[PDB]
């Protein structure tokens, strides 16, 4: 019952005749553009990414919607935000379907929830649940026994070896800044801003303590993205490596009494849709980022992923991406 | 070849058993929300509407697009901005088709261009060109021989008499703030802000002189809307009278070197889509406006027009309008 959108897609060069390409796409969670240092926030919430050459920050990115179930399938859609509908997304060919058909090896590790239908047509072995300590080795580093996003990097070299010489796209779906318990989202080495709200009744938190917990969780995501780049750099001789980060949606933090996310796009405050995006690539790859102030949305993700693998598809041929 | 959307529409009460309803919808042109006094502009650009009881200003209205051809059909569409497509709008049943089928008498006078397909299924006599001095009696009041929006009010009592006792919806498509020659858009009694730019090469205008011409054209629209209300008030004993105003799109005035409108929504600056909207009703009508800060778009127009005539249609049943 698949409705196709890119049966014409062609890959202009193959990994038997040029370097294979290895990309990590971090599918972020709950992060707000306006809490990113690079976008003008008053605090340095991304100190480690600031030191990495080759990172581009995008200051004007709007998510497709305000929730995981709405945004995540739209991020991988061909249809764009206007014609995307959540009710039928599962039956559309999505960009991972196309890349898999073209021979890219797809992996999805999830420390959040699940792929919201995006992985459903691909073999079940290509999806792995990293919220569970059965699979994630990094869960006892905090009082909540919460498995951490950095645990998704453990053992990726085995996936690379099993796909030796092929193009690869790895999605890491992070827990990130999920609320309401922002204080649970980061280990103690990131407990920089204090005091913190440590209750789930957010309207009873002092506003600054809630912001402080949220910003500490951002520091842990800065760390996770930095470690994902460092992992890619261990493969940059054999593979052309790049990393894309985009959050699924933002978050309200008490403005006008609004908390969490999920508001319909018709009425949602801007904080629920203004999201960070970062793109990193190694110097060898020939990939050129777009200008930092390009007006961008989740609709740029599908053409970016196709372009990273040298794929053209008529449906998105002239659509703006995060890269040229 | 009509694609229907509201074949279920029903009118809950008819003008043989309650007062007939008479509405003017001013389809505006090029006006920016941020140049409206009520929205926080630094100048009083709407002094006459300020004095009329029963006017509601809406501070958060976003147009469907940035041009006449895109926005005008969307304003009367059932589909909403996301699923609206300009290429097939002409074949969809629109809200005027539904209201005409239900017995509302539709009139469209145009001092701008045309209805962009919206009137095309209705008899040609229901559309009248008021850009021409053959039909518009008010064109020699300025050095440009430009026919004025207030000329569209002349002789409306004859339309009311020919439709005596029926519900009526009159669209007045104004020239408004059309550029680039903003200085041509208003007669001398509105030449309040000076000096003015009087050239069509906008980037050579001093910025303040360009703003001054634009704001003088707003004063003439304040006057035209006030006179449209005053006209309605001459019929408020026999008819339940109301007036809706919404602009088709905004305008760039030199911000970052951008002038005029028409930018694709993907990249358009906010000034091209943030538009004023006003709603007036007489005290007798029982119509209640929404809160001034309701998040609104052109998608609110179709349910507003249906609600004004006591019509329900499943497709827009729970869609937010400018009124309850
Ligand atoms: O515009 C839809 C919005 O982005 C989305 O968050 C929904 O409100 C939510 O998915 C409903 O559960
Ligand atoms: O998003 C479309 C935009 O609103 C519209 O103004 C078009 O750019 C124009 O109609 C093209 O001519
Ligand atoms: Zn710092
Ligand atoms: Zn989320
Ligand atoms: Zn969740
Ligand atoms: Zn949830
Ligand atoms: Zn949709
Ligand atoms: Zn739909
Ligand atoms: Zn729908
Ligand atoms: Zn649907
Ligand atoms: Zn494969
Ligand atoms: Zn410590
Ligand atoms: Zn005044
Ligand atoms: Zn226009
Ligand atoms: Zn025009
Ligand atoms: Zn034009
Ligand atoms: Zn469309
Ligand atoms: Zn379309
Ligand atoms: Zn289209
Ligand atoms: Zn089309
Ligand atoms: Zn009729
Ligand atoms: Zn004078």
Author numbering:
A (entry chain A), B (entry chain A): 218 to 541
What does the article say, verbatim?
MCR-1 is a phosphoethanolamine transferase that catalyzes the addition of phosphoethanolamine to lipid A to decrease colistin affinity. The location of the catalytic domain of full-length MCR-1 is presumably on the periplasmic face of the cytoplasmic membrane, based on the predicted five membrane spanning helices in the N-terminal transmembrane domain of the protein and previous results with PEA transferases. The catalytic domain of MCR-1 assumes the α/β/α fold characteristic of the alkaline phosphatase superfamily.
The biological function of the enzyme and the tetrahedral shape of the density suggested the presence of a phosphate group covalently attached to the side-chain oxygen resulting from phosphorylation of Thr285. Surrounding the phosphothreonine are three zinc ions, which were identified by the anomalous signal and further confirmed by difference maps. Zn1 is buried in the active site of MCR-1 and is tetrahedrally coordinated by a phosphate oxygen of phosphothreonine-285 as well as the conserved residues Asp465, Glu246, and His466. Zn2 is bound by a phosphate oxygen of phosphothreonine-285, Nε2 atom of His395, and three waters in a trigonal bipyramidal configuration. Finally MCR-1 contains a third zinc that contacts phosphothreonine-285 but is not coordinated by other MCR-1 residues and a fourth zinc that is bridged by a neighboring MCR-1 molecule in the crystal lattice. The peripheral location of these zincs suggests they may not play a role in catalysis and may be a function of the high zinc concentration in the crystallization conditions for MCR-1. The catalytic domain of MCR-1 contains six cysteine residues and the cysteines form three disulfide bonds between residues Cys281/Cys291, Cys356/Cys364, and Cys414/Cys422.
